[PDB]
Amino acid sequence: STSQVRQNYHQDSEAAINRQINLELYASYVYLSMSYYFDRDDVALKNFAKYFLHQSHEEREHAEKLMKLQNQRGGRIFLQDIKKPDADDWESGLNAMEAALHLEKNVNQSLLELHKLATDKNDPHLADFIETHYLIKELGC
Amino acid sequence: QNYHQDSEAAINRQINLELYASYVYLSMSYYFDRDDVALKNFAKYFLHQSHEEREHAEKLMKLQNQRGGRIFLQDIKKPDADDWESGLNAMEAALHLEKNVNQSLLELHKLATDKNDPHLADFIETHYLIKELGCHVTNLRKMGAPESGLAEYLFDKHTLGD
Amino acid sequence: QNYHQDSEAAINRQINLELYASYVYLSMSYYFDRDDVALKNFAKYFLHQSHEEREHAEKLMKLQNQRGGRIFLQDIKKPDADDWESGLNAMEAALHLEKNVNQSLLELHKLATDKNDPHLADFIETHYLIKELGCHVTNLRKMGAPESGLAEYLFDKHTLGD
Amino acid sequence: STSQVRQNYHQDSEAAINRQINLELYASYVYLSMSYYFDRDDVALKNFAKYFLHQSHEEREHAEKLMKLQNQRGGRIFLQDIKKPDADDWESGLNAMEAALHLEKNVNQSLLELHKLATDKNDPHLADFIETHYLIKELGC
Amino acid sequence: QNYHQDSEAAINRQINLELYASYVYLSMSYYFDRDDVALKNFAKYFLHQSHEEREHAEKLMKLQNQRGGRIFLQDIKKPDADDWESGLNAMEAALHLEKNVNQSLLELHKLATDKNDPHLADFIETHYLIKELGCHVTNLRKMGAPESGLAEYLFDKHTLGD
Amino acid sequence: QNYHQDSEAAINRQINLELYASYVYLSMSYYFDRDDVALKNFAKYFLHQSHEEREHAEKLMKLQNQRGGRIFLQDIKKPDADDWESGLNAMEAALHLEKNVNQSLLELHKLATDKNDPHLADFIETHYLIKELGCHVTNLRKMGAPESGLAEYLFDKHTLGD
Ligand SMILES: [Mg+2]
Ligand SMILES: [Mg+2]
Ligand SMILES: [Mg+2]
Ligand SMILES: [Mg+2]
Ligand SMILES: [Mg+2]
Ligand SMILES: [Mg+2]
Ligand SMILES: [Mg+2]
């Protein structure tokens, strides 16, 4: 039924988190694909390949910090297929950055709609977790 | 010649198999992180292995890029369970999984007939991981798992705490 | 405006709740110090937590003094048991207690709507303590407590000895 | 009529640049407004105020580098009203970051639609200017 | 009392006036950057002044925040010309502009009656800038501008090259 | 495939165009060295540019050799004038020349579709040289050239003496 640690954790947030977990795993897959595109000698842009491999590891680390939260609050993790990124070729180097911009802002407006949902269900703990997660993801550098 | 496009496909399939394995141990790790499961070293064990299997996927990605092949990703499927039931059952599953991933790893080397013997370094370690999961499965059963929640507790401490 | 005197009362009530919690873990600590109970690390665990919850009470006292409120102490009630029966039962009790103290801690922040987010640092750690007592309760039950006096003995050694 | 230095500069690009100039001036105004919001003692978040003041100076510097381009290619600069940013209060600190995300991606997808238009009108010079402008604006840190 | 909200409005209006001035000299700077105008030091002169007038706007923003007022931004209007015709005409325009911005700067001090005399530091420099634009206008006219394109060329070199 | 032999021809034609430009500015330089013309800095300006355009020709020669193409030289034609009439007229000519050489430079990049973007570094600077010759032409006309021999004298001193 229900977890001995659960407290003030709306079913709606538990499911928004499960979706955010898959989203960030998807983003990690996309970045990984883009990284090894700029690895191939067709392209051989080592600084792009480095940059995206870094962002792929960081998006995967965020997914784990989301999974750690779910467990900390008695939510239950439910994983789905990590879907194939919708390109293999990425063509240009700036066609990649365009794709990363729609992904990065999709990931981010999903966090904000999770902060919205957090203050709806008066959940200071979640709200504060997402907020600090969002500002480090943006203002870290 | 149909070797380059068979070697290319095999590596493409091995990339997906290692990534899937990384997904499975990730799933398993955070099952032992549940407050109602609560075996920290079981969690550490699988999370560490989850990173090993992703390292291997990138090495297969690096490799296909040097062979002049093309990387062709596919969906990473969800693993068969959300609830892994017990410490014993998670190990038995890893053992089962690692053997099959090992089998198609062979055929990629079996067709490779490569001068460099590419992935064979990593094929050698899969045989270490198999005997290890074997030894783990054995010890847990002999101790009384999975119905003896004391067995897995003490195995979490004494075997997976080093 | 009725916010200052509601914020003032909430903090006054949270002061008493943390002090009561410090009293409960003090009681629990010296139960495991009984010669007929004799679980030293269970004793250390609760005695340490008993000081944490008193630290928090003084921080709520410091806090009300900076908000210009007035501290209004009340009796610190005796805890519900003198005999805590078992290691398992003491944890289950702490879990129950910490959740309720957590609930009114929310409402003090829920009304605070404070620029500084005052006590929210300490509200974040109550959620760590809850998952921890959860994991403890789980491990003891899976091991066979509370009727297996061996379970609690080995949990005292292996989980609470670090 | 037409400038003695003009060469391969489509009228369409000259107008896309004039619009991009005003866009980045608008972005500089918005960032400046947000910066001095986090300056007021209601808020007093010095690190947010610092961050946005920096981004306000940088968006204004980009506008000048656009104006320098227009002149370098015989385009003619036409400036419009810099419109009042559509808030004074910015409320939260994360309500600001949300506003910056829709602004920042509006600014950026406007650059990309200018790179699109550049390769349409086979303008290697413009295309390369925008491309390097876009990657420094993103990968600078 | 209606002083705080009049002081607040004046500063709000002075913020917009300085920002507008920064816009005007920005416009003027890049007119002299045109390949068909081509007076680099005229360009440097106005671009530098364009930054001075923006510095002042932020100081008026900092100032309203310390007086506990609220900053209320408005549109920054486009300047009256896109083509500034000549070096002489741009100076005559700056002179005209700076005098009016100076006038409402007075009234903000004239009502301020402030203990600290806030913006009066910056009000003193507007009177230096006016006499300077005066001297510039004069020299260009005496030299034969704006119809003597040699006059402005040599003024660009000899007066605005230091 | 007809790209290698079109890329090869374009570079061959760009080699000749840059060499011709180097010849034109060489001619122009020593016109201002005539005792009856006598503008030293006009002479230095073009002689320096004459070397820049030859540097570029050799880089296009180095480039065709790395693309595995063959260098196919042609006559370097005499420039259209022996007498360049005035400082203004020499600049107007350079402006005209540099624009056309720029145009076929595009088409060599427009067909290149190269991974490395070879000559695009040098294509970017032609756009700096154009705006500069533009600014020069403008300043000389505004000053009264070419019939004002004082205009070109002072432009030789004040603009081309740095
Ligand atoms: Mg992320
Ligand atoms: Mg960013
Ligand atoms: Mg493997
Ligand atoms: Mg507490
Ligand atoms: Mg910008
Ligand atoms: Mg002023
Ligand atoms: Mg050239």
Author numbering:
A (entry chain B), D (entry chain B): 4 to 144
B (entry chain A), C (entry chain A), E (entry chain A), F (entry chain A): 10 to 171
Q: Could you share sentences copied from the article?
A:
Structurally, the 8-mer protein is a heteropolymer that is composed of two different subunits (Hα and Hβ) that originate from the same polypeptide.
However, we excitedly noted that the inter-subunit S–S bond formed at subunit–subunit interfaces of the 48-mer protein nanocage when its crystals grew under the crystallization conditions containing Mg2+. The structure of the 48-mer protein nanocage in the presence of Mg2+ exhibited nearly the same geometry as the above-mentioned 48-mer with exterior and inner diameter of 17 nm and 13 nm, respectively. Except for the inter-subunit S–S bond, one magnesium ion is bound to two acidic residues (Glu141 and Glu141′) and two water molecules by coordination bonds at the same subunit–subunit interfaces. Comparative analyses indicated that the formation of Mg2+ coordination bonds is a prerequisite for the generation of the inter-subunit S–S bonds in the 48-mer. The formation of Mg2+coordination bonds with Glu141 causes a movement of the D-helix of two Hα subunits by 0.9 Å; consequently, Cys144 and Cys144′ residues from two Hα subunits are in close proximity, resulting in the generation of the inter-subunit S–S bond. Consistent with the existence of the inter-subunit S–S bonds in the protein crystal structure, we found that this large protein cage is stable in solution based on the fact that its size and shape kept unchanged over the time range of 24 h after the crystals were dissolved in buffer.
